[PDB]
Amino acid sequence: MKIMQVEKTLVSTNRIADMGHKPLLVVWEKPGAPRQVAVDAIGCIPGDWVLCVGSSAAREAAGSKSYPSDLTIIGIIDQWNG
Amino acid sequence: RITGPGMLATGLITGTPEFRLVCAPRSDQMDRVSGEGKERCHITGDDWSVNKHITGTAGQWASGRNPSMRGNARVVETSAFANRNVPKPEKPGSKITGSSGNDTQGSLITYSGGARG
Amino acid sequence: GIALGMIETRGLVPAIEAADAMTKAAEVRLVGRQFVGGGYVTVLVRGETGAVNAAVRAGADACERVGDGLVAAHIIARVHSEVENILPKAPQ
Amino acid sequence: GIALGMIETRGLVPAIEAADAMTKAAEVRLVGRQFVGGGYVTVLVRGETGAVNAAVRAGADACERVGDGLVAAHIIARVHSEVENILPKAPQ
Amino acid sequence: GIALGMIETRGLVPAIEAADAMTKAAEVRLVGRQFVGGGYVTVLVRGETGAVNAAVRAGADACERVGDGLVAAHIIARVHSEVENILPKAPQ
Amino acid sequence: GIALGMIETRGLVPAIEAADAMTKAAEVRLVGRQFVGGGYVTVLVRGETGAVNAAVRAGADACERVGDGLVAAHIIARVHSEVENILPKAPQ
Amino acid sequence: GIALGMIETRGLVPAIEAADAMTKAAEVRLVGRQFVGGGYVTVLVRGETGAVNAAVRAGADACERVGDGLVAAHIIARVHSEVENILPKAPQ
Amino acid sequence: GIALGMIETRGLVPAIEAADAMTKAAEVRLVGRQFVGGGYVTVLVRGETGAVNAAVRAGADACERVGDGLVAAHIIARVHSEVENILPKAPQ
Amino acid sequence: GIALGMIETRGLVPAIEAADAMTKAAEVRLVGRQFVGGGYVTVLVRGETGAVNAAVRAGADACERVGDGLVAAHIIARVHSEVENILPKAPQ
Amino acid sequence: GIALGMIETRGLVPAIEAADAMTKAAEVRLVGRQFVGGGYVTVLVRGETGAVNAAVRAGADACERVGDGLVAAHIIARVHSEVENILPKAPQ
């Protein structure tokens, strides 16, 4: 798992039906770092330090063993200073 | 004997000295006029609908005016939709080996001479 | 005329229909429409006894099949002056 | 009038009918008509004890077949002094 | 246009939908939205008879699968001047 | 006495009856009556714990057969100070 | 953004959950929370169509199992100008 | 903190009790009590995540057998800034 | 009021209950308690006629199952001035 | 304390037993022992509600098999203020 900060929301209107109704966030390890997209399974707001799961673990965390996520937020870190 | 408002709502009024789905399912109904001319939804009040007593604009009043005859012409549609189930010959198979993008499960692709692509 | 006519309905539509039908039927004045809670709406008319009789019956017939329907159609020929305090005068 | 009478109905029309019957029946002052929530209406009358007794009997009989009907007819001969604070003084 | 078209819903979402559909379906002026109590919401439109006829059919069709749905679809072609007092003029 | 005793009823009449009963049964002060929505009404008393206990038990027996009756009788012996801000201080 | 998204719920907690999930999911502005009557709560968002689509889809899934649940989840991409008058501009 | 804990109950008594179990259990501030319509009451707390968590678990166990009981028990760790505008800030 | 309500019991406990119950029930004043011999005990209440009917009905129902219970529940709506001399005036 | 506990016995010995039990059990003051007539003896306790409840339970269980035994065990949490005039303040 990685620790990332939510930067913004991401919207893709044409995305594949398998993503369901899941929200998508732009996350980066740090301001200015490379941007990744994570499924938001929790409900996170911009500026939050969140914990991100990758691989197969991401799929189940995002609702199913067959979900199309390789990156899912799985928790907000109560206190983190980055 | 006496008609007027006194004959209404009998059995509903109290205080008198004597006392003292809207829309019809889509599967079941198909509308004669679609759009704003639909009738599937019950509209109460002063709507434009016509009851039993009413005669005159459509029906025999439109259909009886001009004489017509219907033939029994020979009708067989020739179209892409009609040809959807046209007999087709046996689909070609591919016997090639070697890496060639040889998918057998997708849509049918053909090559020159009818070959499977 | 001091006779009170009253229609109660489940929903506003039957109430508006009732009010329209009543005032069209007879010489009555519309004095209020009240939202009671739970979806009850009451429409109230004033006028002379017969006019209110004709009106309330007209409203009842009119709104019975409308929406969720009629709850009450009631007449009081003369209300006690105490009850004037809980009756609307004009509809605002 | 120390006494208190209350009638509760489903809808306003039975409440009006109850109020009228209560006040015609006996020397009781209507002090409130309350929209409780959910369709409940309460009418409250004050008066001398026997007057309240008679007024709540009448009310109950008057409103019972009107609309959605009667929920409660109740008499409290002398309410505790604390209760007086939650009691309406004049209908609003 | 002085005809009234009215839609009553269980919930606000079906009401907003009825409203949008009605206003898009015909030349009708939306004059009100009313919270009636208990979850009922009524949308009221005005316009000419044909327009209203068309608008209410559109609202009904559109809102019926939305939320808790449709209670009533109704038209009053000619509205009595008295009822106008209980009819919202412009929605607020 | 700082304990809180509460009774909730379906309708105002059981609530008034409960309040009368509670103040009469024990050394409790009435601090509120709240219309909660949907027909629920709540009566709140304050006092020493045992008094509140005697009172709520009496309010419950008294209201259970009045109208639509009782929903809840509850006691809270020490109210956290945060809860005091949502509690009515004296009855309106 | 001029598209509209609306979520209706049975109870207020599912409404907040839906509102939070919408606002988190995309760039929509929450412009209103309406207490409809009867326990219906509606939440309205406004923004660009895609954002709105995403926001509603997310809120619907988020509040469906919260409390008493979801009633409706609706999107109106282009809103008739008449319907703007009945739509809240800022949350109260 | 900015976590939000919410309990929604059928009736006010379970709500006060939930508010009370919640604020005793953990360091949370009660920012609100809300009458939703239809009998639903919501109590709202705020605090750090752990605290809100502990409060919502305590409040939910406490109100479940009180009155008409519990409808929902929900937590949101980090409330979106748009949702803050539909949230009560002081109970009042 | 000058009406006399009287209750007679077998033993003091039912009499005290009778007295409490009568005074709580209606606007009556307790004027006396008399020990009679043999265990008979009499409570007396004065007040307006209706208030005394209400008070004695309550008193009777209250002491009947208490201890040895009720012997007599009687009302006199006007007392002759001669009987006033053998009547206790102020209790104790 | 405002609450009143009373035990009534057939004879003095059960009364003394009840008294001793009541005062041992809880903090209550013995305010009166009364010879009623006919052999009824009444003991009276004052204190806080719970203290009275426990004392009367203890008193009643204790004296039931002593002598001719028990007649009544009765509790009034708050007597009407008039009933105070007929209650003893200290035993004679």
Residue numbers in the entry:
A (entry chain v): 1 to 82
B (entry chain X): 712 to 731, 773 to 869
C (entry chain A), D (entry chain D), E (entry chain F), F (entry chain C), G (entry chain B), H (entry chain E), ...: 6 to 97
What do the authors report?
Among diverse BMCs, carboxysomes are specific CO2-fixing BMCs found in all cyanobacteria and many proteobacteria. The carboxysome uses a polyhedral protein shell to encapsulate the key CO2 fixation enzymes, ribulose-1,5-bisphosphate carboxylase/oxygenase (Rubisco) and carbonic anhydrase (CA). Carboxysome shells are typically composed of three groups of structural components that form hexamers, pentamers, and trimers. Here, we generated recombinant α-carboxysome shells of Halothiobacillus neapolitanus by expressing all the shell proteins (involving three CsoS1 hexameric proteins and two CsoS4 pentameric proteins), together with the C-terminal domain of CsoS2 (CsoS2-C) that mediates shell assembly.
The cryo-EM structures of T = 9, T = 9 Q = 12, T = 13, T = 16, and T = 19 shell assemblies were determined at 2.3-, 2.99-, 2.93-, 2.75-, and 3.04-Å resolution, respectively. The resulting T = 9 shell atomic models closely resemble the T = 9 mini-shell, with root mean square deviations (RMSDs) of 0.33 Å over 928 Ca atoms. The T = 9 shell has a minimum of four different interfaces, whereas the T = 19 shell has a maximum of 10 different interfaces. In the T = 13 shell, only F3 (Arg712-Arg731), F4 (Arg701-His732), and F5 (Leu773-Gly869) were identified, whereas only F4 (Arg712-Arg731) and F5 (Leu773-Gly869) were determined in the T = 9 shell. Intriguingly, the smaller T = 9 shells involved only one conformation of CsoS2-C, whereas the second conformation of CsoS2 appeared in the larger T = 13, T = 16, and T = 19 shells. From the current density maps, shell pentamers were all assigned to CsoS4A, although CsoS4B was detected in the midi-shell samples via mass spectrometry. Therefore, all structural models of the midi-shells were built using the sequences from CsoS1A and CsoS4A for hexamers and pentamers, respectively, which are highly conserved across α-cyanobacteria and some proteobacteria. Fortunately, the density maps for the T = 9 (C1) and T = 16 (C1) shells were retained at good resolution. In contrast, the T = 9 (C1) shell map did not display any additional densities, suggesting that the CsoS1A/B heterohexamers are likely absent in the smaller T = 9 shells. Nevertheless, we cannot exclude the possibility that the possible loss of CsoS1B signals in the T = 9 (C1) density map may be ascribed to particle superposition, instead of symmetry-related signal suppression.
